[PDB]
Design a protein around this ligand. Structure first.
Ligand code: CA
Ligand code: CA
Ligand code: CA
Ligand code: CA
Ligand code: CA
Ligand code: CA
Lengths: 196, 196, 196, 196, 196, 196
């Protein structure tokens, strides 16, 4: 009954400043990207066989700035506020805002070697709370965590925190973007209009 | 420490009308039937090794009407409102309100062939959120989902939605009933009076 | 790059009259049903590994009428106008409008024996014009066949013709419905909004 | 990515009275003891490979009183109020408040035989709701169960209930203490200051 | 009767601006490049055994801008208008307008490792509508798709969409170029003057 | 479901003049000959396993003239206008209008050696656009190619071009005729009256 799908897709646009800016995104079908969001909605539950966020630059080699990424699993835990804190995280990766080209290898699905420089990171998957999660809409999710944060752990596996700093301008400068490459198993189809 | 039990039991009386009527029932010890409800209460948690709802007719071959069944897993998802929507569901089955006799095979535990006509359906079990669930009383459950629906997924594996239409009368006509046949593992006994 | 999916879904509601009524439906993702229509749209092309239309009754054993189904492959060919003509078709099946319950076996995915009575039929698949077809929207398709019918063969594998007669009333009487059970391979994902 | 750790530590001081006194403690890193509490906080989630509470006496052979222990898994379930109820629990153990010396064997990690007399009990672990749980602080936990109890099952595996009675004084008499011996797997490190 | 040929050739000059510019090119002998266009014309039909478009930079490391490429198969489908949409496409690749040097490996036919950074992408080939396509002249093709777009799928396997943005000037800045490396099978020779 | 048939049949009468005369004929059931035309119409689609046009003389050894034959696959391509152009074609054959007797071997199905002199030619079949083609009536075909030529490639595999010249009279002189020997697979039967 399992429908397995592997695909890459744009997940977020990245810009730099001269002051650190920490953000985060849930690691669930609905939020990884528009495409998977629409597809996944047609199935009741799902499971991450592999999820990897990989950053790809679009700026010049002269661009000042650096990106940092990591994973958190207990949505109740407070989000990092410094590179130091973020560096403690699982799957922490760091690199110049203009580096990370070698990450393409992954997005392309193509097999490659020169990956050392890649600003890409993967999820535990085998160490997530459970295997099969329910497809949630940010709206429904939001309401739940509104009652209480912990109501989220049974709804989502983890979040990806992102930090950007070391830029030269106080006004965001487009550096590149984060693509999400995933292999997901979708199960128990449902009329999409009913999936919340 | 596992106490395994296999048993069939009456789960619901079914009637037909000339207008569709969609209903649903949680797939947990407490709600499948009175018998299992009393037994299961004596154990802290449990696990579905196999759960199957099978419809058995009691009306004449001339009885107008049809039954439809399917499963939903994210209690937050909205319940189907049409046969079309219900038909998208996992384990969807459909049939004349007077057909479904061959389903007896299952209830009886007896091994049989002529099952094609059976209006019976089984649960994923291996694809449920988790394996071991806590025994809940509808009352306690109700309160929880009252705070927020999602508080339910860690409490129950799935719900069975049922649709009845194509009847000849606008006044319910007894068509037959739905029996539940299950093989459950019960663990961590408790004084029943304490189980909520 | 192939995403394989197996699923059943409601395809059409069936009613009977005392005069023959021939209809037909394209055998492509967009038209088989609402569910697959939405899912499939997210992929550029696709391929039928298995497609079967199976009729399921909802009326009483006393219901007068009979259903007939078959396949046509050259959309330019004219649609049958009689049971005799339809009976010549590939995969022609015929049966009482109240028979066909054993077909459930197929929809359920469950393995079964007592299939002889089933009013279900399957597509050649291996004998279709080609293997991979482009996902089309009825609108876009319509326009094309408007210029010329033959512009369709490279767009769709086949059509299912349906005939209903031998009813007792001159006013349609709900007999049952046709579900479509398919195993489809979807390839070359695309933003759904762009798929025409 | 798993950091495995085995260790024993003081979990609670025990005293007796002439009237029964039932208490309970969550079986999670934060509450088992001060040591593990500090260590475990440095990791996002964790898993119990083995948890055992073992009672060790400190009183004279002449000391009147008896201790009782057991496990509950559905925090919503009401806590036992009698030895009879408690005796139904999983892993129930009972013994004279001055007996239980042989339990040392376990705390010491040392391999031993004369264990029959040991007032020690172990957790299901394999039968817990899930394997990997999130590190929670009693404060955060408290808030959650404040909204609703069930919000706890996805946060904690089980609780240990303790009953003390048969003492000679109505004023607590120090009998001994409960040590916790565990083998825990900690994963997905985090800055401790962020763990809630 | 098959004449197999492997060769690389310039396919398009690339320039950047500060506003996105989406373009596309058919993936057929006539349009991949002048050389293959002349050669292929001498044969009635042909087949892509391997087609890969690889971008090679010519600008300085300081050049602002990024390129994006992907494939579409149903010429009727509307062309992407954003990087997000394009990122959903099959074989989507993205990278800094000054990166992509490692792609040379491919053009050169030479075997190499450090390919991760390569801004190169390959065609499905095995998943194309059919294997053998007819050699078409853009003129003849144009006329056909003029009557109706769908008349194209039996004429061409796919199109390559290209997007360029993140540049520093509103006036195109030469960034580099796209070369096409292909291994084509040509069959059923014809006097070139007759091939339309 | 495949009905395989092997048969030879008269395809065209041939005459010579002192000026070249180029003609062509579609290679589809409907046009190869009257017999196959009637038979094939009873089936929806078909496939050429083997098709060979072989010329047989009926004139005296003193008859001036020569015949030329070849195949074209892209109906949009312009028809040859000279022997030189025709000679470039796939399966080009040439010979004296009074030679070609040895071709009988083929028509007869009989196995023979002295074939060198045979003015017979065979189709690629394995290199055709696709395997299964739809049975078309010249009328319906004509209409389609009227809208646009390319609408034909998905309708027919190829055409046979014929050139006759080197005759002694400016008034056609009966030289011989072209027979078609084929092994065709017919599938998906249909009432002939409906086949267009
Ligand atoms: Ca949902
Ligand atoms: Ca309970
Ligand atoms: Ca399309
Ligand atoms: Ca935590
Ligand atoms: Ca051509
Ligand atoms: Ca036809």
């Amino acid at each position: 009954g399992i429908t397995v799908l592997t695909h890459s897709e744009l997940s977020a646009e990245i810009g730099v400043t001269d002051s650190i800016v920490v953000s985060s995104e849930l690691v669930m079908p609905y939020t990884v990207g528009t495409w998977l969001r629409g597809v996944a909605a047609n199935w009741s539950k799902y499971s991450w066989l592999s999820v990897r966020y990989t950053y790809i630059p679009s700026c010049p080699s002269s661009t000042a700035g650096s990106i940092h990424m990591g994973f958190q699993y207990d949505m109740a835990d407070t989000v990092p506020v410094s590179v130091n804190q973020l560096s403690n995280l699982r799957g922490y990766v760091s690199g110049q805002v203009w580096s990370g080209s070698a990450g393409l290898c992954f997005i392309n699905g193509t097999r490659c070697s020169d990956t050392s420089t890649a600003i890409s990171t993967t999820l535990d998957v085998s160490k997530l709370g459970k295997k099969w999660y329910p497809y949630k809409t940010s709206a429904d999710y939001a309401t739940a965590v509104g009652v209480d944060v912990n109501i989220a752990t049974p709804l989502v596996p983890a979040r990806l925190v992102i930090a950007l700093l070391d830029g030269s301008s106080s006004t965001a400068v487009a550096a590149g973007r984060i693509y999400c490459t995933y292999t997901i198993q979708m199960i128990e189809p449902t009329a999409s209009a009913l999936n919340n």
